[PDB]
């Protein structure tokens, strides 16, 4: 099977969004990538025994949406809500970013995956239990990732694709 999937990586600035999307595609960590640069990425990979076409938007910017983002946010089939496990503020903003997606698409069942990045850092501030509790209440998976070591990077993204498939089943 050949199916396309529009994914949107959301989250506060500097949580890992860029370096995390770059890792899935080029299998290499990038220390410094322009914090306000927003463009799409594409990858053809097999998920659940089907060749998937991934259209991923690494998001940035704080003002009104560029026409490309405006449409990615309305057409996006699934969303990665990313926060840094060493930054409380990125975890607090997740509840806002969720309400954003819910109001944009006018639905309560929107495919989402909660991602706690930077788990390689020994300076953890957001307990794993907290985000696990939050994700269970939202009814979405929670995957801790490290773009530096690539741990869970493939899982978190592929899990979002699985959640899009599950929502399309109902």
């Amino acid at each position: 099977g050949m199916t396309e999937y529009k994914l949107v990586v959301v989250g506060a600035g500097g949580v890992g969004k860029s370096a995390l999307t770059i890792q899935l595609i080029q299998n290499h960590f990038v220390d410094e990538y322009d914090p306000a640069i927003e463009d799409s990425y594409r990858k053809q990979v097999v998920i659940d025994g089907e060749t998937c076409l991934l259209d991923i938007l690494d998001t940035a910017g704080q003002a009104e949406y560029s026409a490309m983002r405006d449409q990615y946010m309305r057409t996006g089939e699934g969303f990665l809500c990313v926060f840094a496990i060493n930054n409380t503020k990125s975890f607090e903003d997740i509840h806002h970013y969720r309400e954003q997606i819910k109001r944009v698409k006018d639905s309560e069942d929107v495919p989402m995956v909660l991602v706690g990045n930077k788990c390689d850092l020994p300076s953890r501030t957001v307990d794993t239990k907290q985000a696990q509790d939050l994700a269970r209440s939202y009814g979405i998976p929670f995957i801790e990732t490290s773009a530096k070591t690539r741990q869970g990077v493939d899982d978190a993204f592929y899990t979002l694709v699985r959640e899009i498939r599950k929502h399309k089943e109902k």
């Binding site: 306000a36 927003e38 463009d39 799409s40 009104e64 560029s66 026409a67 490309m68 449409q71």
Partner: protein, 322 residues
Amino acid sequence: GTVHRWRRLPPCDEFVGARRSKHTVVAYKDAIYVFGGDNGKTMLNDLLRFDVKDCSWCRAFTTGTPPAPRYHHSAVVYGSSMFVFGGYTGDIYSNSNLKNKNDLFEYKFATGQWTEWKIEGRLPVARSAHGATVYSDKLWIFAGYDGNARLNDMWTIGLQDRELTCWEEVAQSGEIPPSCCNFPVAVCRDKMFVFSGQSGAKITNNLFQFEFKDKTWTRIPTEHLLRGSPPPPQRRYGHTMVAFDRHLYVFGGAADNTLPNELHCYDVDFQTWEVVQPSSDSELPSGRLFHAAAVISDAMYIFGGTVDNNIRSGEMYRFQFS
């Protein structure tokens, strides 16, 4: 009244039209014509008319079926009529029936006549956030977002006879700007100019000029700034650029994490930049993006936009050129 002065003109009351962004502004005679946009809940297709003389806002009189409510569309002038092209159409509140457009509408200022130009033959890809302008009796459209990727093609359409005209795609040569959207376009001398704009991975503060006569793009080597000249304005998107007396005036937009409100002036002949100094008694407009601009006589008019947080604006500002 003073030279280089920001005057705060009476904003458009919600009694006439909702505060909006992503709209179009058009100058004709001594009036500003505002069309389309987003009020925060839904897309709009009303037509507003601001008379510069009495500073009177007004819901303009129309007859025919207007274009579908939309934003990120273009609007240009040709004689006694306005021309709207493209945009984003659907229902925001329910997030349904959303699509980009490539239709072409005419608005005769004399009669208020809305008339769709149903063009046959091959059409440009339906797009939004593109740039558009008029030159040599033809409507020029450039770049934009089509729903799949950012664009960099260019098309023309004759604006003389609806029955005989059809779309042609321009064979561009030269250093074409990278795929862009949410940028302003301005024509000066015999050249079309494009400054910055959301080009994703390749976003910079480069100034491109397009020579109409030989279809040639050129990146302005404004790196001469290192030899005394002031640096060009910081890279941005959703800003407005107007031309007046061989000078490009760039205002507004969202620049990374900021919403600067410096008024930048590009001396097109000297190929230098400058930050214009407003008067001591100027009512400075707050930083904004997705506003639209026009020029009447020797003044620039700024209407609308999003002004920090997500507060949409109906404010009208007038900068008096020399």
